[PDB]
Structure formats: structure tokens, C-alpha cells
Amino acid sequence: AECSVDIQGFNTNAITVDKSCKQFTVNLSHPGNLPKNVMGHNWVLSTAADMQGVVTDGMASGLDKDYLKPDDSRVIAHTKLIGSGEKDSVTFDVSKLKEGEQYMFFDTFPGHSALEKGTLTLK
Ligand SMILES: [Cu+2]
Ligand SMILES: [Cu+2]
Predict the structure, then answer these.
(1) CATH number of this structure's domain 1-123
(2) Looking at the DSSP assignment, which residues form a beta bridge with residue 78?
(3) Phi, psi of 108 (to 5 degrees)
(4) How many whole angstroms separate alpha carbon 95 and alpha carbon 104?
(5) Which of 44, 38, 35 is nearest to 56 (CA)?
(6) CA distance 51 to 15
(7) Which residue of 29, 73, 85, 104 could cross-link 51, Cys pair, CB 3.0 to 4.6 Å?
(8) Cα(20) to centroid of ligand 2, in Å?
(9) Which chain residues have CB less than 5 Å from ligand 2, an ion?
(10) From the CA of 69, how far away is ligand 1's center (Å)?
(11) Strand, coil or helix: what is 99?
């Protein structure tokens, strides 16, 4: 089945990964005209349980860490932080994913998590 998804930064509020896929790719795109540094976006994947932890410590860490705490072991996958006309794409092992667990995708650029947030599920 398909196992890439195109996301603009969110047009989708919800991703489902086909249980039959071995890998999965998120192509992320930035729509506007502003520098990564005043209006950059990422796509981060953690379990719902961990989302808020990744976000707050990611805010605390700088632009220079792409707004993610270094060695954050609760982050399953993510795209680089990106700005205007920059695109990024992350490909992860689907074996990292457990059917019947609730995952969240989100943006860790300060504040964007309240609107740029979604659900991903292995099904
Ligand atoms: Cu397939
Ligand atoms: Cu954003």
C-alpha cells in the first residue's frame, strides 16, 4: 500500500501507516515566505504520552538545536526544522511503531504545537 505522506506546514490532522509497510516517509513542505528563524516548522513523532515533554524541552533548547532537546530518546522520528522554500522528508522503521498505541505528530517551533499537531496510528 502507500507509505509516504505529503504534509504542508497542517493540511492533515491525521496519518495512518499501513501495518504492511516496512518503512514510512513524511515529506514536509513550508508554504510561506519567512526565514526558518522567525517562522520555521518541523514534524516530530512521539507517543501521546511523551508529546508535551518533547515540546517544552524542545522549546527550551534553541533554534540552534532545531527546537528539540539533544538525545531526546522519546522522539521516534522527525524532520529538520525548515523555513520558506525549504522542504524535508524523514523515513523511519515501521518496526519502531506498535499497533494499538497512540502516537502524536507535532511541530516544536515555539508555539506551533497548539495548531500544528496530529495523530498517527499503525493500522
Ligand atoms: Cu507496500
Ligand atoms: Cu510551525
Answers:
(1) 2.60.40.420
(2) 44
(3) -100, 15
(4) 17
(5) 44
(6) 16
(7) 104
(8) 30
(9) 41, 107, 109, 112, 116
(10) 33
(11) coil
Q: 109: which 3 cell numbers?
A: 517551533
Q: How far is CA 106 from the centre of its chain?
A: 5
Residue 78: enclosing H or E segment and its boundaries? strand 77-78
Stated resolution in angstroms: 2.4
**CA 23–ligand 1 middle distance (angstroms):** 9
| Domain spans, the chain | 1-123
Centre of ligand 1 from the C-alpha of residue 8, in Å:
24
Return all residues near 112 (Cβ < 8 A) that are at least 6 apart: 41
Q: What are the helix (H) ranges across the chain?
A: 36-39, 51-60
Experimental determination approach used: X-ray
Side-chain-facing half-sphere of 80: CA atoms under 13 Å: 11
